[PDB]
Amino acid sequence: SNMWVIGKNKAQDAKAIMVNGPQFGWYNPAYTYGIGLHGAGYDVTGNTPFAYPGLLFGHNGTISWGSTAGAGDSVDIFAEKLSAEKPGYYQHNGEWVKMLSRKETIAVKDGQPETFTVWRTLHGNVIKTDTATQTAYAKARAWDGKEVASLLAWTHQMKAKNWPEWTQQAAKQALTINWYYADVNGNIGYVHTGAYPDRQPGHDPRLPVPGTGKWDWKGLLSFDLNPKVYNPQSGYIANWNNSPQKDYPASDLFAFLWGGADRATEIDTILDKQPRFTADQAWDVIRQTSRRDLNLRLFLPALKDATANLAENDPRRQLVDKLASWDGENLVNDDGKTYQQPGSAILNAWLTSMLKRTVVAAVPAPFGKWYSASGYETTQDGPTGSLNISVGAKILYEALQGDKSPIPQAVDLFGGKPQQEVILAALDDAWQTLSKRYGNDVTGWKTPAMALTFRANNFFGVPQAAAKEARHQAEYQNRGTENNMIVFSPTSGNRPVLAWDVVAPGQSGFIAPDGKADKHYDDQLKMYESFGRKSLWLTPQDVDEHKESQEVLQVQLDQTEVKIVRDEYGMPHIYADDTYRLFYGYGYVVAQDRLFQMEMARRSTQGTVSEVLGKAFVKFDKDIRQNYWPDSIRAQIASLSAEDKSILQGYADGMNAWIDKVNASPDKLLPQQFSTFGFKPKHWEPFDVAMIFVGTMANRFSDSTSEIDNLALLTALKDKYGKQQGMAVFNQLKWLVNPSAPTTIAARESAYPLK
C-alpha cells in the first residue's frame, strides 16, 4: 500500500494533494465500495473496503484522510505453563488459573459436521499446544478488546475539521495502521496509529515469553510515543509499508524487515526531482511506481563492479550491460504478452541464484526456504498483491553494503569467497537458464510480462462471485487496488476541493437472476487499466448535477424517510438527519450493490462458509473460529452508547430492508450467485457488521506474529553456530531495528525514544 501527501510548499496550483494506493489484491466485485454520507454531522465522499461504516479513503470538504499498512510489533506469544494433573489450567502469579473454553460446531453442506473447542487464557486465545514442554501458546494482541472502538474511531475521524480533532480519533484506533491527513489550508500530517505494549525490561518481542506472570506487559504505551509528524520540513509524507521513523521496530514476522533496501525510496526519488507537483503530476506518480523494477537500483552497482574487467564477448558482461542501459521501467510490447526489456527476468534469475549461494546456504534447513524468493514470483494470473524487495534480497543488500551496513555480519554470507566470485557465479547460472530459454542473443529476448487478475474468490480463498466472473488485465501494475486523490484549494475553478478515484471493476457487483449484469458492474475496468479516474462529488449541487437517479427510502422502524442519490457511476449518496437513519441508508445501498460479496465476507469472517459451500472450507472455518472470541466482540457492542450502537444497528437494519425485498421477489432481485451456490440471504445484526471489520481489517493487517517459528529458527541457528554466534546470526537475519531503514518521518523531525 502506498501514499504520497504533498503540502503547500510542494504543491503546484493547490494547497495540498493526497494520493493513496492501498494494496489489497484484485477482486471482482471490487475490494472497496464507493459511498457518500450527508447528515448527522457527516458530509463525506470516498470509498472503503467491504463497505465499513468508516471510510478509509476520502474527504469531508475540510480535511482528507487515507491509510497504509506497515505494522510495528503489537502481538506477542505467551508460553503458558501447564499442569499434568490440572488439564485446562495454567500457572499465573503463583496460582493455577482455569482457561476459558467454548465449543464450536462447523455445519457442513452435504457433509459431516465437526465439533471442536477453542481455548483462551488471560493472555489471549491458545494457538498451539506442545506436549513435550507442557506449554500452551497464547496470542496477545495489544488491540484485544478495542476492535469495535477502532471501527468507531475510523468513522468518527470523518467528522474532524483540524489536526487536533483528527489526532483525538487516531489515538482511539488500536490496530497498527498508518493514517494520513491533509486539509483545505495546505496542512499535512501523519500518525502511525495503534495500541502498543509497554513491555518488561529485557523482553525480546521476536520470541515467546513465559506466561507465568513475570513477563506480562506493564500495560500499553502512551499515544505520545506513536510516530507522528505535522507539516514536515520536506513538504511531503510518503510511505510504501516502510518504517514510520528512525529506530521504530517492525512486527516480529521473519518475512518482514525495514532495512537499507526499501521500495519506499522509489517514491522519494520521484518527489525530490522537482520542486512542486500539480494534481496531474501527483497522480502520474502511480504510473511511474507501478512500472518500476525494485531491484535494479539495489544490485546494479555490485553487478557493474563484479563485471568491470570482463570483455563485451563475455555473456556475464552482456547481461550486466543490458541492465546498465535500462531505465528500470517495465513496459509491455504491442503483443500484450512480453516486456520491452529483459531486465526483470535477468534480475530474477541472478537474485534467485545469489540467494541460494548466500542467505539460503547460511541458514539451516528447513529455514533456508524463508529467504529463497527473489521477489519476482508470479503465476499465469500474475502476482496476487504488490511486488516488493524480498526478505532474502534485503539481507543480501546489507551484506553487499559491508561496513556501510549498520547490521553486524555475524556470519559472512559469502562463506569466505570474495563477493565478486559469488556475483559472477550467479551470473553464470542466470546465463545458463536464460540462454537455454531465449537463445544466446540478449538484444532479442522477449520475456513474459506479468499480468493482473481481478479474482472471483476473496482474499480468504472463499468465492465472492462465480468463477467465470474473474477479470483480466494484460499489464500487471504495482499499484493500489483502488487509487484516489484529493486536491485542496485548487487555483483553477470555483470549488475549494476536488477529488477523484477508481473503483474497479465497478460500483456494483449485481448480476440479475437472468444473468444480466448491472450497468455499473464493470464500467471502471478500462479506466483502471489506463490510469484514468472519475470525479468524486461532495456538495449537494455537484451530486445533484451528476446524478443518474434519486429516490426516497421508508425506514422500517418508524416509517420516516431517507433520500438516496446515485451518481453517473452508480455511487450512492445518503441524506439523513441522524446516525441511525444515515447508516440505514448506507446498509441498504450496500445490500443492493454487493449482497453476495457481503454475505460471503460475513461467512468468511465468522467461519460459516462450509454451512453453504461444503467440506472444502472446513479447516478454513475452524481456523477462523479459533482466531477470535465472539463474547469479547458482543460485550464491546453491548457496552456502546446508544449513538455508537445506532451506527451498527442502522447499517444492519438497512441491509435487512433490501434483503426483505429480495426474498419477496427472488425471481427478479436475487443475485444470480445465490442461485448458483444454492442458498438465500438472511438478516444481519450489529455483530455481523462489526465482524466484517474485525475479520478483514484487524485479522488481515494487525494480527501478524511468527514468534513460534522465530524460536525454531533461533534454536537451529544455535545448534549450527553455537549459542553466541547463533544469536548474533538471528540478529543479522531478523534485526529488531535497522537505523539505515528509509522512514516516512525524517530523523530531524523525530526518532523513537525507546531503545
- The residue ranges that bind Ca ion (CB under 5 A) are 73, 76, 205, 252
Q: How many angstroms separate the CA atoms of 754 and 113, rounded?
A: 50
205 or 570: whose CB is closer to Ca ion? 205
Q: Which residue stretches of 103-161 are H helix?
A: 147-156
CB of 79 to Ca ion, least distance (A): 13
Counting Cα atoms < 13 Å in the Cβ hemisphere of 517 gives: 16
Is 334:310 a contact under the CB 8 Å cutoff? no
Q: How far apart are CA 627 and CA 698, in angstroms?
A: 11
Residue closer to Ca ion by CB (options 296, 713) is 713
C-alpha distance from residue 235 to each of 129, 188, 263, 438, 624 (Å): 51, 8, 20, 47, 43
Distance CA 24, CA 31 (A): 8
Of 410, 366, 370, 368, give the one whose Cα is nearest residue 390. 370
> In the bound complex, what is the minimum distance in angstroms from residue 370's beta carbon to Ca ion?
17
Q: Which residues contact 266 (CB under 8 A, 6 or more apart)?
A: 240, 289, 292, 294, 297
Q: Which is nearer to Ca ion, 252 or 644 (CB)?
A: 252
Tell me the closest approach of the beta carbon of residue 711 to Ca ion, in angstroms: 11
Nearer to Ca ion, 163 or 752 (CB): 752
Neighbours of 630 (CB within 10 A): 15
Comparison of 76 and 688: residue with beta carbon closer to Ca ion = 76
Residue 1 designated active-site:
yes
CB 205 → Ca ion: shortest distance, Å? 4
Q: Report d(CA 3, CA 720) in Å as an integer.
A: 42
Strands (DSSP E) found in 177-234: 177-183, 188-193, 197-198, 209-210, 219-220, 228-230
Q: Give min distance, CB of 176 to Ca ion, in A.
A: 11
Please state whether beta strands 534-535 and 209-210 pair in parallel, antiparallel, or not at all (unpaired). unpaired
Nearer to Ca ion, 73 or 501 (CB): 73
Q: Which residues pair with 246 in a beta bridge?
A: 751
Least distance to Ca ion, CB of residue 142, Å: 10
Q: Which of 576, 530, 536, 541 is nearest to 557 (CA)?
A: 576
User: Among residues 73 and 80, whose Cβ is nearest to Ca ion?
Assistant: 73
List CB contacts of 154: < 8 A, sequence separation 6 or more. 52, 53, 54, 55, 56, 169, 173
* The C-alpha cell that represents 417 in the structure block: 569467497
For Ca ion, the closer CB: 249 or 463: 249
Minimum CB distance to Ca ion, residue 204 (Å)? 9
Which residue in 598, 480, 375, 483 sits closest to 69, CA to CA? 480
Of 1, 150, 344, 702, the active-site residue reads: 1
Q: How many residues does the chain have?
A: 755
Residues with a known catalytic role: 1
